[PDB]
Amino acid sequence: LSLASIHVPLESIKPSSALPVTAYDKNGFRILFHFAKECPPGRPDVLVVVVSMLNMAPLPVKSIVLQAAAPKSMKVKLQPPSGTELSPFSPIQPPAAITQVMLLANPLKEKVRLRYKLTFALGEQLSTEVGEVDQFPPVEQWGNL
């Protein structure tokens, strides 16, 4: 099982009819998982997720690094992010967002659980946030979400 040869272009991702799930939300910084409608070509086992990161707090956030871990029977891959910083929210302009394509291979069709480590900085001040998400679409519906 691998995901090495899989790269799903952001622009190519169609929306599913599912609601985004909250992976992390603290101090105006929320990360949601947007489940793609389709699977990569030839990969019915891969759930394509558009991870969004939004900053609604008055302070800017930089050095944003998201990492994930999946059950041994699965494989998780994170494509490069659209960026690593989020400007402070400003009523005058649309919120600053970062998107990161995450791929999850679940060949055996088991229940999905995803751990993550969020790392970022406010100025030089470091932050490390860890968590577990277990709100995913039924594996049976992957590919036609």
Binding site: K77, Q79, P81
Partner: peptide
Amino acid sequence: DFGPLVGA
């Protein structure tokens, strides 16, 4: 039983 942390 999880795998290791993975990053871009």
